[PDB]
């Protein structure tokens, strides 16, 4: 269908979470739990956010590197939909993440960061992963705009059957230049939570996505 | 010269981590805030740790991949002496981790694992990082996979260019003689410490055969 709207709770506590989820929880279509509130507060996040939101698809950004049927398994025993795992990951981690979310009718994203291959990403497809991160990481940006290479990579994961996640410092603007691409999300964090309308904020993002889809 | 001893408290709540510090928090030079534990229980478990043992270093073993001076800054104002940055993430991440631990009179360390380059590990000592963890993981050990030649050489290599090495992933005691005559800075044992009939008796093996071995 159309490329569905997620925000990012990057927030240190609950309360400050909550602040946004008030605001805007029915104006979008994924809570993340970020990867600040999952190291700020742990898995109660997960389990607190998917029970306000249970008609929400709630994704934890754990970012799991290691352990991956441990702490997938956290995560999804406290009702997340998906998990990430980050790509410098081993393939087994990956995979154990994987086995654990079909347990609970979940499902695992691989965040694409920094030095990646295309045979990784055939080794992701191989092993059953379908969906992907393609995360611009703010530290590169607080430094890295968005351009055609980033176009064409995001493409080729697409056809070779990810659904692709685009995210990292986006902003309403950017829309466009991801037309005639089936992207599955587009996350916001910071561009939504701190609007000076929040609500104004996601509604712009879900309009424009409306219009380019 | 010796290397020191870290627990790696991969524990899904506090109290199964206290159930292992009771016992060995006095038989180990550093407590690891593992991972687990971080994403458990939040960055309660560094400030309640450090709360616990004062006198130790606490590493929180947050593996920070983006956002590093977020993220550092919330395990440092928890009181955390050290934290950890996959060695994946952007350049700035692990500066931006840096500059707070800077602050704070604490350090960063690199994960390594998987995929990273010698050139990389340049860009890391140009930028401060004196510390690096040769982190083999646990889902490759699953796999069936073995301290070997490569990783002795990578080990002095690293030992070379200036960093204090780590080494970690599923250590056990038998291990430790692979990596005599190499200046290891810290072994890291969570499960074969936790997990021991007597993790006090475990560790204190552990410390012997470090004494013996260097
Ligand atoms: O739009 P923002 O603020 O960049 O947030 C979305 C990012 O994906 C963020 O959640 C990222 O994962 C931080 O590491
Ligand atoms: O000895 P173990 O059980 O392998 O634990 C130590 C590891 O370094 C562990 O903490 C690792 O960081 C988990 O990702
Ligand atoms: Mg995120
Ligand atoms: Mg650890």
Redesign the interface.
Same mark, same amino acid.
């Given at each position: 269908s159309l490329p569905m709207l997620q925000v990012a709770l990057?927030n240190?506590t609950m309360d400050s979470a909550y602040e946004t989820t008030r605001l805007i929880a029915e104006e979008v279509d994924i809570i993340e739990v970020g990867? !600040?509130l =999952?190291?700020?507060?742990?898995? *109660?996040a997960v389990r607190d956010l998917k029970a306000l939101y249970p008609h929400k698809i709630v994704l934890a950004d754990? &970012?799991i590197?290691?352990? @991956? &049927? !441990?702490?997938s398994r956290? =995560?999804f025993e406290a009702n997340a939909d998906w998990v990430t795992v980050?790509? =410098?990951?081993?393939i087994?981690?990956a995979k @154990?993440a994987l086995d654990v979310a079909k347990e609970f009718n979940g499902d695992v994203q691989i965040?694409l960061?920094?030095?990646?291959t295309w045979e990784q990403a055939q080794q992701w497809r191989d092993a059953g992963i379908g969906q992907v991160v393609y995360?611009r990481? *703010?530290?590169?940006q607080?430094?890295v705009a968005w351009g055609e290479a980033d176009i064409t990579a995001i493409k080729r994961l697409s056809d070779m059957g990810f659904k692709v996640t685009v995210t990292g410092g986006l902003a309403l603007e950017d829309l466009p230049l991801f037309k005639g691409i089936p992207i599955h999300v587009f996350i916001a964090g910071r561009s939504i939570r701190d609007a000076a309308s929040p609500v104004e904020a996601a509604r712009q993002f879900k309009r424009s996505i409306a219009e380019l889809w």
């Open positions: 990057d240190q990867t !600040i =999952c190291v700020g507060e742990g898995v *109660r754990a &970012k590197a290691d352990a @991956g &049927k !441990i702490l956290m =995560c980050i790509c =410098c990951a081993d087994n981690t @154990g965040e960061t920094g030095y990646w995360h990481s *703010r530290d590169a607080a430094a």
